[PDB]
Each structure stands twice: as structure tokens, then as C-alpha cells.
């Protein structure tokens with residue numbers, strides 16, 4: 001079949017910052033030892049993929065981006081034991097080698113084999129993609145905006161064969177990150193007051209986790225008032241737009257919560273909202289979690305007295321989940337109806353319309369657009 | 374005999390920043406409702422009292438500083454029920470009203486009735502001290518650099534009648550703060566690697582707590598190498614002087630710990646060491662606690678990606694302990710030989726030689742100087 005052969009297929013190649021993805025033919029090499037070649041079925045558009053196009057994130061170009069997705073194994077290289085041809089899988093943008101000291105720690109999830117922004121390759125340092133005869137870089141070891149991709153085994157998890165890939169691709173990034181940020185990283189408590197800054201796909205998933213944790217109050221914060229209705233549908237008890245007030249938003253949230261909230265989340269990616277989210281939590285016992293990706297080459301300025309009083313400030317990737325252990329469990333929980341993903345899906349488009357999906361996100365009109373291959 | 378009447382005694386008044394304390398005759402009013410007048414027996418010289426003199430901390434002047442101390446109750450105002458004349462007590466620079474949101478919270482200890490720097494008075498907004506035809510401000514509700522002081526009842530804890538006050542005054546600030554920072558705020562784990570920046574009285578107490586928690590490695594960091602022998606006596610496994618290295622201290626500690634420490638503590642009061650302490654903790658699961666007091670009105674600058682990878686940054690006052698509940702317990706623990714205080718006392722002087730005590734601290738030769746009244 002195609003096993004052992006170079007596959008020619010369609011992919012979305014980003015050749016330059018601030019330009020449209022180029023949908024064109026690429027050559028995908030067969031998998032080497034401990035690698036998995038996957039036929040993609042659905043991919044979501046995450047704001048971090050847009051960060052590569054705007055320069056917010058600096059990744060080596062040209063590149064095949066995409067990290068929130070699901071597909072079916074087409075073939076495996078020598079030594080693969082955790083997946084087989086025909087299995088439904090989700091690529092893991094943070095790997096889980098299971099042997100490093102972070103993988104063995106009870107709370108860490110940033111596996112030391114992670115391939116972050118500067119490392120635009122597979123684990124062996126090379127690429128499996130060619131376009132117009134030129135080598136193309138990988139992204140986060142996943143590169144899912146392609147009809148076929150090749151990933152390292154520690155970067156892929158087998159999931160339930162009955163799951164709907166057009167929905168569960170969100171477990172690869174958006175949903176898990178927000179939900180885990182509330183239930184695992186902040187460990188929101190029953191009856192608490194939470195403030196969530198940013199009501200995109202990840203922020204809505206933080207609201208779902210605060211509601212599942214039993215929070216009594218969930219204040220959504222966004223400058224785009226069109227995001228409020230969906231936020232309330234999934235759990236927000238109130239929504240506030242910072243542009244409607246004469247005072248800084250942290251002052252407004254502190255007054256609203258009678259002294260500061262128990263848990264706050266920054267799910268935007270701005271330095272001023274990271275500082276405001278910290279400030280609006282209660283000065284002695286509040287907890288603030290940074291989920292948004294800050295702008296490249298910019299430092300945050302803050303008064304350390306905000307921490308000395310007793311606040312906890314922390315960040316996390318992928319909701320704190322150890323990726324290969326958690327993604328299959330999250331898909332099984334979805335199959336058991338333990339959470340819902342339809343509230344995050346506002347648009348469905350064929351993969352070929354990827355640029356239209358990115359323009360929907362940039363214009364503020366969508367939450368998650370799912371691309372179907 | 375002195376109950377209900379003004380007491381004329383000596384106190385150390387600070388009339389101007391960067392000047393010596395003046396031992397002067399002051400008038401101490403009798404205690405009003407729910408107030409306790411205390412005969413001081415011993416007071417420790419903490420670097421935060423020196424911060425008032427240097428301008429690192431801004432407090433309304435003139436002022437009677439002092440907040441680490443122990444004494445005996447001389448008289449009680451109307452309604453007092455938790456202490457009686459003749460009881461040994463430790464003034465609490467952070468109160469425990471028992472009724473506010475923080476006091477009712479399981480982890481929080483900055484009671485909403487705390488009198489911080491701008492609030493140079495008793496709880497009722499007035500002063501009990503007069504000197505040279507003028508009212509003198511209080512400091513942290515305690516003002517212990519006086520033969521007699523008056524404190525609100527939510528700011529005083531009764532302790533064991535057989536307690537050695539010349540030693541347990543350190544439970545009023547340095548010891549408790551450092552020890553709690555490790556065992557209650559950071560919750561140091563057995564077998565972990567800790568880094569302690571600053572080896573003064575509070576840093577040595579942090580080392581005592583990390584050793585009590587079973588850390589496997591405790592790295593003391595100080596630019597004054599004369600502080601290393603005592604740090605190793607109380608538990609440090611190694612000491613490093615940043616001046617001996619070409620690289621910044623956070624990189625040195627990251628290498629020493631093969632990727633970052635589990636727990637780091639800033640116990641100095643500098644913006645750059647607060648950022649260095651956060652950077653030297655492990656990027657996915659490290660915890661950094663800010664204990665030092667930074668300079669007034671100055672923000673720090675940092676890369677938020679230090680937190681997005683998974684680090685936790687927090688600060689705490691008085692080791693996270695709820696004060697009225699914890700001070701008597703810590704004194705009982707001292708009487709039962711659960712911890713030691715002599716390692717922190719390097720010098721003893723009469724109260725009349727307070728300026729010499731501050732000169733000792735500023736010269737780098739002392740850890741804690743205990744003043745006897």
C-alpha cells in the first residue's frame with residue numbers, strides 16, 4: 001500500500017510570517033524507527049498556530065504547523081509498540097517519554113524530550129517533509145496541518161476506536177489545556193469564586209473545569225462582548241468587558257468578589273492581563289494561573305509585593321496533564337459523556353479552507369474551527 | 374499600681390530616616406478596650422526594622438519600631454479575655470481576628486485587620502505614645518522597642534509561663550518566618566533539593582525547616598562567605614558565593630541540581646535575586662518562595678515563560694502561620710526541644726545599646742542580636 005513509501009499529499013506550508021498558508025503538495029517520508037505516520041482526519045485551529053504566523057511565537061520557517069488534531073495510523077516504523085496501523089490517535093504536542101525525571105515526578109508534565117519552538121524537527125534532528133524539493137520544518141513534533149504527518153512514538157497516543165475525530169481533536173489541545181488548568185493546576189475548590197480572562201476555546205474550557213470543580217461564581221472577562229453568551233452557556237455566572245469601566249479590571253474584580261477572587265486564569269496572552277489576573281486574586285490565599293502565551297521578547301513588569309502577601313502565581317502547559325497517560329483517558333471520559341465539546345465548535349471547514357479558518361479566528365468570529373481532511 | 378495610669382518609660386524613637394534611634398522618655402497610655410499593655414523583656418533586631426531606618430520600608434515618622442519580641446502583661450483593658458497581668462506573651466505583627474475571610478480560610482494568614490506600613494497606629498487609628506509634645510506612631514501594631522508597649526488583643530499571644538523570653542522572642546518573627554516558609558508555604562518534600570538565598574536569621578530558619586522536612590540537599594547562597602559556617606551547622610549541605618562565579622547564580626544552581634532545584638527561597642530582599650531564585654527552580658515543577666522585603670515602589674521585570682513551563686511562585690508573610698494559633702504552639706515545640714534557637718543568636722546587648730545592635734547587623738557580623746530591657 002503506502003507503507004514504506006514516500007507519500008505525496010496536500011499540506012499547509014507556512015513559508016513566511018504574516019502571509020497566508022500555502023496549500024500545496026508535499027512529500028512525506030515513511031516513518032523511521034520509533035516513528036508513526038498518521039492520516040489526519042480533523043485538526044482544530046488554536047491561537048498558538050496563529051502565533052507562528054504573527055511572530056508572537058518564533059518558529060523556524062518554512063514549517064508545517066498544526067498541533068490540535070486526530071487521525072488514523074497509516075504505518076509504523078521499527079520498534080513501535082503503543083500504536084498499530086488502523087488505530088485512531090491524537091498527536092501529543094508535549095511528549096511523554098515515561099523515563100525522564102519530569103515524567104516520573106507526580107506533578108510535572110514538561111517531558112525533557114519536548115521539542116519546543118527552536119527545534120523544528122523530529123527527535124532525531126531531521127525532517128520528514130519536503131516541498132518543491134526543499135526540506136520543511138516540523139512544529140511541536142506534530143505538524144498536523146497535512147493530510148499525512150510523521151511523529152515520534154512518545155508524541156502520539158492511541159484513543160478509542162469509536163470516537164468522533166472531528167470532535168475529540170480538541171482533546172489534543174484546547175479543551176484539555178483549559179479544563180486541566182482549572183481542575184489539575186489551580187485545583188479549583190467547591191464554592192469558590194473564579195475569574196477567567198479570555199473567552200476563546202481555551203478560556204471556555206477553563207470555565208467548564210471551574211464549573212465541574214463546583215465553583216460558585218465564574219466571572220468571564222473579554223473585550224469582545226460577543227463571546228459572553230457562550231461563556232454563560234458553559235458556566236460563567238457573569239461576564240465583564242474591561243472597556244466598559246472607568247477603573248482597571250483588577251479593581252473591578254476585587255470589588256465584585258468582596259476582596260479578591262479565589263482563582264484567576266489568564267487565557268489571552270498579554271502581559272497586562274497576566275498582571276491584572278494576579279492582582280485580582282485575594283492577596284493572602286488567591287491563586288492565579290497563566291495559560292496564555294506571552295509575546296516574544298517582552299518582559300513583564302510587576303510589583304513583588306503582590307506575591308509577598310501570600311498569592312500563588314503559576315503557569316502550565318496542556319492543563320498540567322502528562323500527555324500520553326491523559327489523552328486516552330480524556331477521550332474515554334468524553335465517550336462516557338463526562339464533558340462536552342460541541343460548545344467549543346463554531347465552524348467546520350474543509351482543510352483546503354485553512355486560511356478562511358484563521359481569518360475567522362483573527363476577526364473574533366469563531367471559537368474553534370475544525371478542519372476536515 | 375501602674376494599672377489605669379500613664380507610664381513614663383524609655384523607648385527607642387526614630388525621628389528621621391537614616392539616623393540613629395533616640396533612647397527617649399516617652400509616655401505610654403493605659404490600654405483601652407481590648408488592648409494589652411506589656412512590659413517588654415526581650416526584643417530581636419530584624420532586618421525589617423532596619424528597613425524602616427534605611428527607607429527600604431516607608432513608615433510614618435516619628436515611630437517606635439520593633440516587632441520581634443516577648444514580654445509580660447502589665448495590665449489589660451476592658452473586655453480582654455485571652456491574657457491576664459503577669460502572663461508571658463509575644464506581640465503579633467500580623468493579627469488573628471478569627472472573623473475575617475482570611476482568618477476563616479484554611480491557608481491564608483494575612484488577617485484583614487493587619488496594620489501594615491502606612492498605618493502607624495493602633496487598631497482604633499490613634500496612638501498610645503507621646504514624646505516631646507507630640508504623638509509618636511506605632512509600627513505593625515507592636516512597637517516593641519519600648520520598655521512598655523500597648524497592643525490590640527488580636528495582636529498578642531499568651532505563651533508558656535516557663536518560657537525563656539530572651540530566646541522565644543525569635544518566634545515573634547525570624548524563626549517562625551523562615552521555618553514556616555519551608556514547612557508550611559513551600560511544603561518542602563523529603564529527598565528534595567532546596568536553594569536558600571540569604572543566610573541571615575530568616576534564611577538560617579528556612580534551612581532549619583528544609584532539614585526538618587528531610588531535604589536531601591540544601592544549598593545556601595550568600596555574598597558574605599562568613600555566613601557559611603553557621604548555615605552548614607544548621608543544615609546546609611553546601612554553600613555558594615555568587616561572587617566566585619563567572620555565570621549568574623541561577624545558572625550555577627541549575628547546573629548543580631542537574632536541571633533546577635525543587636524549592637528555592639529568596640530571603641534577602643532584592644529584585645534580581647527574586648527573579649534568580651525563580652529561575653533556578655526546575656521549569657516544570659519547581660516552587661520558589663519570596664520571603665525577603667523588596668525596596669519600596671520598585672517593580673521587577675521577568676520573562677513570563679518562566680512560569681508558563683510549570684513553575685510556581687509565591688510569597689508569604691510570617692511563614693504562612695496564622696499567628697495567634699501558631700505562636701503558642703511554636704513556643705511549646707521549643708520547650709519540647711523540637712527546634713533550636715541558640716544558633717540564631719550571635720550577640721546580646723542591653724536595650725540601651727540598640728544602636729550598637731543595628732550597627733552589628735549592618736556590619737555583616739551578626740545574625741540576631743537580642744536586646745534585654
Ligand SMILES: NC(=O)c1ccc[n+]([C@@H]2O[C@H](COP(=O)([O-])OP(=O)(O)OC[C@H]3O[C@@H](n4cnc5c(N)ncnc54)[C@H](O)[C@@H]3O)[C@@H](O)[C@H]2O)c1
Nearest residue numbers: 047048198199200201202222223224268269292293317318
Ligand atoms: N498553556 C498552553 O498549553 C496553551 C494551550 C493553548 C493555547 N494557549 C494560549 O492560550 C491563549 C488562548 O488561546 P485561544 O485559542 O483560546 O485564543 P483565542 O484567540 O480564541 O481567545 C483569546 C480571547 O482573548 C480575548 N482578548 C484579547 N485581548 C484581550 C484583552 N486585552 N482583554 C480581555 N480579553 C482579551 C479575545 O477577544 C478572545 O476571545 C493564547 O495565547 C494561546 O496561545 C496556551
Ligand SMILES: NC(=O)c1ccc[n+]([C@@H]2O[C@H](COP(=O)([O-])OP(=O)(O)OC[C@H]3O[C@@H](n4cnc5c(N)ncnc54)[C@H](O)[C@@H]3O)[C@@H](O)[C@H]2O)c1
Nearest residue numbers: 420421571573574575595596597641642664665666690691
Ligand atoms: N516575609 C516576612 O514575613 C519577613 C519576616 C522577616 C524578615 N523578612 C525579610 O527577609 C529578609 C532577610 O531578613 P534577615 O533578618 O534574615 O536579614 P539579614 O540582613 O540578616 O540577612 C540577609 C542576608 O542576605 C545576604 N545578601 C545581601 N545581598 C545579597 C546578594 N546579592 N546575594 C546573596 N546574598 C545577599 C546578606 O549577606 C545577608 O546575610 C529581609 O529583606 C527582611 O526584611 C520578611
Ligand SMILES: C[C@H](CCC(=O)O)[C@H]1CC[C@H]2[C@@H]3[C@H](O)C[C@@H]4C[C@H](O)CC[C@]4(C)[C@H]3C[C@H](O)[C@]12C
Nearest residue numbers: 046048057093115116117173293317678681682
Ligand atoms: C505549548 C505551547 C504551544 C501549544 C499551545 O500554546 O497551544 C508552547 C509555545 C511556546 C513554548 C514555550 C517557549 O518556547 C519558551 C520555553 C522554552 C523551553 O525550552 C521549554 C518551556 C517553554 C516555556 C516553552 C514551552 C512550550 O513549548 C510552549 C509554551
Ligand SMILES: C[C@H](CCC(=O)O)[C@H]1CC[C@H]2[C@@H]3[C@H](O)C[C@@H]4C[C@H](O)CC[C@]4(C)[C@H]3C[C@H](O)[C@]12C
Nearest residue numbers: 305308309419421430466488489490546666690
Ligand atoms: C510583614 C512585613 C514586616 C515584618 C517583617 O518583614 O520582618 C511587612 C513589610 C512590608 C509589608 C507589605 C507592604 O506594606 C506592601 C503590602 C501592603 C498591603 O496593604 C498588605 C500586603 C503588603 C505586601 C504588606 C504586608 C506586610 O505588612 C509587609 C510584608
Ligand SMILES: [Zn+2]
Nearest residue numbers: 046048173174
Ligand atoms: Zn494549542
Ligand SMILES: [Zn+2]
Nearest residue numbers: 097100103111
Ligand atoms: Zn519524559
Ligand SMILES: [Zn+2]
Nearest residue numbers: 470473476484
Ligand atoms: Zn482576621
Ligand SMILES: [Zn+2]
Nearest residue numbers: 419421546547
Ligand atoms: Zn521581622
